[PDB]
């Protein structure tokens, strides 16, 4: 945690010729040597104590599993929660490892690479399924579930191992995306919903047509589990206030629109059948249709807001449950006169993660593609007003030099 939260203000890690046969300068130790030494020490300590922090598990046969469970209950040295916290901090350090090598680096060049935590993920999943209920409907447990799914996706460990294996026996084999959509708790925030949807998209690399496809060729709801999962993913508590996306930036908006487009494409017959005011006679299906319509409308409204009002106070984001020091300063002060707010000039602009948001180049191109996909196959993209406005915005910004197009954006727009 110290490594991850280290203040990296004056690091300035670049190759210096004069340091070929020795480390950085004595006065440059804290700047260009401390972080590299710290991460090398982390690597060494992990390689030393990985088998102690996460002991190797052995299922063996049924009797072997019983013996393993008895041993674990006899010696529950570390519980699943703290083991998961350790693994999460290790994964964060591995993702934010030191990448740049120097000629003065006497060690191997392969050292400055992210770690492989497949065994640790397997062990923590074993302990999670060993305990009765690792996940809870609370938002903190939603964050833990998101972190566990992220660990599984990153380290290519199949999911559901955190969950009891009886469900796996019932479903024969469940992919990571299917497990996420089947066991994902209903979120309370649009940010949590965005994280869940991104995990859903990332779990199935190319089998997206098996994890969010619940309809047949005629529009009948085949798999109700996926329907219920999507319904609780797009919850009213997360997308109900008509300002649910007030803290959603361009990347999260792209994630939302991509999720909506994928759902529509995988269930095209169902949507084009039941969008004609035809009653399904199923409260679950009606609720799902209403939730999808609400999500699409609010996502389009957020995209229009960002496109038409850049950097305006209306189109401003802020980190969820963000800390506003002005309110605390006013609360813990002498309220002799309520119009005499203290530290007004500093506190009016001070806020956690509050920044102006406007559509960029990659963001605009991807949003244009996703809005084009959100319509029908026969719908005229030329007639689509938002797509033309996005394209003209990209052209105007490129001509004004406020952004530049890359080959990815060219391939998206052509």
């Amino acid at each position: 945690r110290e490594y991850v939260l280290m203040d990296t203000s004056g690091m300035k890690s670049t190759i210096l010729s004069t340091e070929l046969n020795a480390g950085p300068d004595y006065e440059h130790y804290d700047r260009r040597l401390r972080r590299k030494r710290h991460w090398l020490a982390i690597r060494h300590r992990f390689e030393d104590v990985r088998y102690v922090i996460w002991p190797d598990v052995v299922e063996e046969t049924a009797r072997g599993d019983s013996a393993q469970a008895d041993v674990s209950l006899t010696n529950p040295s570390l519980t699943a929660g703290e083991m998961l916290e350790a693994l999460l901090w290790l994964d964060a350090a591995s993702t934010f490892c030191v990448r740049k090598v120097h000629p003065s680096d006497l060690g191997d060049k392969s050292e400055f690479l992210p770690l492989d935590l497949q065994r640790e993920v397997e062990v923590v999943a074993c302990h999670a399924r060993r305990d009765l209920d690792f996940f809870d409907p609370s938002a903190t447990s939603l964050e833990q579930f998101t972190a566990c799914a992220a660990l599984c996706v990153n380290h290519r460990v199949p999911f559901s191992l955190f969950f009891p294996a009886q469900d796996v026996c019932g479903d024969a084999s469940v992919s990571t995306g299917q497990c996420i959509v089947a066991n994902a708790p209903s979120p309370h925030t649009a940010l949590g919903a965005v994280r869940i949807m991104a995990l859903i998209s990332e779990g199935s690399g190319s089998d997206i047509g098996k994890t969010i496809m619940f309809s047949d060729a005629f529009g009948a709801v085949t798999r109700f589990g996926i329907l219920r999962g999507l319904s609780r993913v797009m919850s009213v508590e997360a997308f109900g206030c008509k300002d649910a996306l007030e803290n959603v930036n361009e990347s999260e908006l792209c994630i939302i629109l991509h999720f909506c487009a994928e759902v529509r494409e995988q269930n095209a017959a169902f949507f084009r059948r039941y969008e004609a005011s035809e009653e399904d006679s199923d409260p679950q299906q009606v609720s799902f249709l209403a939730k999808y319509q609400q999500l699409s409308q609010i996502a389009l409204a957020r995209c229009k807001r960002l496109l038409y009002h850049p950097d305006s106070p209306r189109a401003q984001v802020m980190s969820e449950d963000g800390y506003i020091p002005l309110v605390e300063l006013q609360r813990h002060a002498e309220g002799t006169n309520k119009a005499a707010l203290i530290h007004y000039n500093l506190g009016i602009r001070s806020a956690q993660g509050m920044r102006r948001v406007a559509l960029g180049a990659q963001s605009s191109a991807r949003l244009a593609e996703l809005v084009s996909r959100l319509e029908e196959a026969s719908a005229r993209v030329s007639g689509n007003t938002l797509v033309n406005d996005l394209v003209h915005h990209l052209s105007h910004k490129a001509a004004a030099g406020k952004m530049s197009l890359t080959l990815r954006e060219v391939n998206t727009l052509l």
């Binding site: 992220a150 994280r195 500093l346 001509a399």
Partner: protein, 107 residues
């Protein structure tokens, strides 16, 4: 594309951009890496923020706390000076010890 526009002030790069031309010298591997790693780092940061909510939230809160508690948050003349150690070199040594040199660039 080798000439700037005196009327509008556009440089030769802007003129070439408007004319659709391309004046880019053959880039070396380090320059290609410089132009290519920005997207990689952005994707890495976005993936980390979407995959580890508690760690990203803690880091952002700590960064905001230090930014808000910083002594020189106000944007006065001294904070708005582009080169503080060079412009206010009278303070160095006697009062401020952060910079050991009063000159870092070609100014």
């Amino acid at each position: 594309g080798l000439n700037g526009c005196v009327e509008t002030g556009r440089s030769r790069s802007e003129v070439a951009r408007d004319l659709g031309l391309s004046y880019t010298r053959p880039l070396h591997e380090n320059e290609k890496k410089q132009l290519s790693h920005q997207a990689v780092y952005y994707e890495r940061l976005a993936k980390f923020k979407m995959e580890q909510p508690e760690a990203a939230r803690a880091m952002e809160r700590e960064r905001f706390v230090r930014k808000f508690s910083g002594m020189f948050v106000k944007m006065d003349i001294r904070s708005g000076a582009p080169d503080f150690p060079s412009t206010y070199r009278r303070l160095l040594g006697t009062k401020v010890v952060r910079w050991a040199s009063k000159r870092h660039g070609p100014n």
